Amino acid sequence: LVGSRHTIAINXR
Amino acid sequence: LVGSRHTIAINXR
Amino acid sequence: DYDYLIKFLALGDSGVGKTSVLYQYTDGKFNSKFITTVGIDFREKRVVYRASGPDGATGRGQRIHLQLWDTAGLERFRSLTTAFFRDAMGFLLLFDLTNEQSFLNVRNWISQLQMHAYSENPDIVLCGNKSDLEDQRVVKEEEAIALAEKYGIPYFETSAANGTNISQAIEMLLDLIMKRMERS
Amino acid sequence: DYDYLIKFLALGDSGVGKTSVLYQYTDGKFNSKFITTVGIDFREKRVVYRASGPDGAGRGQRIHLQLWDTAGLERFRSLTTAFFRDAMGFLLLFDLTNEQSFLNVRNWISQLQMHAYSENPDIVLCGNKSDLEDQRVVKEEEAIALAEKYGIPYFETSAANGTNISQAIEMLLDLIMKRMERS
Numbered sequence: 257l258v259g260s261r262h263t264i265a266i267n268x269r
Numbered sequence: 270l271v272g273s274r275h276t277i278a279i280n281x282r
Numbered sequence: 283d284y285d286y287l288i289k290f291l292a293l294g295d296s297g298v299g300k301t302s303v304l305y306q307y308t309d310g311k312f313n314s315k316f317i318t319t320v321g322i323d324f325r326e327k328r329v330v331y332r333a334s335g336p337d338g339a340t341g342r343g344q345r346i347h348l349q350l351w352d353t354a355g356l357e358r359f360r361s362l363t364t365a366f367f368r369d370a371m372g373f374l375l376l377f378d379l380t381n382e383q384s385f386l387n388v389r390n391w392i393s394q395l396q397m398h399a400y401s402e403n404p405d406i407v408l409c410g411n412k413s414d415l416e417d418q419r420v421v422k423e424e425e426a427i428a429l430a431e432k433y434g435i436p437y438f439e440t441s442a443a444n445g446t447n448i449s450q451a452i453e454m455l456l457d458l459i460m461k462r463m464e465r466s
Numbered sequence: 467d468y469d470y471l472i473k474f475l476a477l478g479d480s481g482v483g484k485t486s487v488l489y490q491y492t493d494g495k496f497n498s499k500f501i502t503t504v505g506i507d508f509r510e511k512r513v514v515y516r517a518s519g520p521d522g523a524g525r526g527q528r529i530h531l532q533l534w535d536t537a538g539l540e541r542f543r544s545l546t547t548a549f550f551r552d553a554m555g556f557l558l559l560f561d562l563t564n565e566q567s568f569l570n571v572r573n574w575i576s577q578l579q580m581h582a583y584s585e586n587p588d589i590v591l592c593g594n595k596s597d598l599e600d601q602r603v604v605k606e607e608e609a610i611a612l613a614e615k616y617g618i619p620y621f622e623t624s625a626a627n628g629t630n631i632s633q634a635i636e637m638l639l640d641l642i643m644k645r646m647e648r649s
């Protein structure tokens with residue numbers, strides 16, 4: 257999941 | 270961090 | 283974790299029912315006694331996720347491993363500035379339909395979410411909890427719905443006690459995340 | 467702000483000092499009164515990691531450390547979880563003043579190797595409460611022998627005065643930073 261403050265890795269994103 | 274049962278994403282791995 | 287491991291965070295003032303909602307969802311159980319949450323906690327649940335098209339066409343189920351995080355309401359806004367908080371993929375924001383102040387505080391909660399989450403516009407589902415207490419109800423449904431429309435977020439009136447709309451609200455949040463994420 | 471988010475998990479019997487070890491490490495503070503941890507908790511600290519240079523060579527990376535605290539009374543229960551298999555390294559504690567907590571170290575390690583992301587995850591063994599020398603009951607040679615049999619580092623620490631807390635945590639950090647891919 258891409259964000260302006262952080263990219264969350266999903267076990268894609 | 271690659272393991273035999275799971276791979277941990279390091280915000281490499 | 284089989285197809286996807288998805289993590290949600292439940293927020294709201296103390297007493298609104300965060301712990302009871304997650305417990306009703308994972309175990310179908312409810313406790314009347316108030317044991318306030320100290321620190322954090324979490325429950326995990328394997329569920330099947332079925333994508334829905336704009337027409338309603340349903341795709342084949344995908345196995346989701348849900349990790350549902352529970353927060354202490356007494357440490358209101360304590361550390362939204364942690365890497366933990368920035369790893370929440372979505373938020374179940376609760377208020378208590380019998381407590382008008384918890385509802386008036388929803389705007390501040392949304393403000394704090396947008397300032398501290400991974401994204402400036404994270405996925406949110408608003409739950410008006412304790413809908414089973416009709417005689418004690420004080421929040422006006424029209425105003426909760428107006429507020430939801432203003433921020434563009436789904437609204438459900440839920441009961442942790444009898445389970446009404448708990449699956450639906452969590453499933454809608456899951457739907458927002460699955461729709462939004464990038465896949466390989 | 468940071469170059470690596472690293473997540474560690476403290477483990478061990480109730481009472482050995484997990485909560486106090488993390489709190490002394492992140493905040494330099496310590497409380498005498500025992501309040502058992504319910505559920506789970508965490509603390510975070512931004513540190514600088516300078517690598518073990520070969521021949522003596524510098525290259526300091528900003529690490530965001532996330533230190534998870536477990537409920538010792540829940541015992542072996544949340545070993546089942548995806549959460550647990552996301553832990554990159556383990557700080558395994560016993561109480562220098564409690565033989566039983568030391569005798570339980572074997573099964574903790576066994577449980578760890580059975581449920582972690584690896585059958586051989588990094589572990590640092592801590593004999594906590596070294597400041598209570600008059601109440602000590604675990605002999606250093608036995609503890610050192612046990613660590614040697616398993617090949618894991620051993621430190622005697624005190625959450626009360628801080629002795630060896632940072633050394634033990636930086637040792638775990640070092641193991642992970644050398645095992646991780648693309649560093």
Ligand SMILES: Nc1nc2c(ncn2[C@@H]2O[C@H](COP(=O)(O)OP(=O)(O)NP(=O)(O)O)[C@@H](O)[C@H]2O)c(=O)[nH]1
Pocket residue numbers: 294295296297298299300301302303313314315316317318319320353354355356411412413414415440441442443444
């Ligand atoms: N009737 C009814 N009671 C509810 C409902 N949800 C929660 N409660 C009750 O309201 C109280 C608060 O519930 P709880 O889940 O602990 O709220 P919380 O948001 O987790 N509080 P805290 O932030 O302090 O941990 C408890 O007494 C619980 O029984 C609901 O939908 N209906």
Ligand SMILES: Nc1nc2c(ncn2[C@@H]2O[C@H](COP(=O)(O)OP(=O)(O)NP(=O)(O)O)[C@@H](O)[C@H]2O)c(=O)[nH]1
Pocket residue numbers: 478479480481482483484485486487497498499500501502503504536537538539594595596597598623624625626627
């Ligand atoms: N003197 C001394 N007391 C310590 C030390 N570490 C912990 N204690 C004390 O021992 C008790 C237990 O500490 P605590 O950190 O709560 O243990 P825990 O491992 O987190 N227990 P639990 O798993 O139940 O939460 C407390 O009274 C604490 O002050 C230490 O290094 N020295």
Ligand SMILES: [Mg+2]
Pocket residue numbers: 300301302317318319353
């Ligand atoms: Mg609670």
Ligand SMILES: [Mg+2]
Pocket residue numbers: 484485486501502503535536537538
């Ligand atoms: Mg504790």
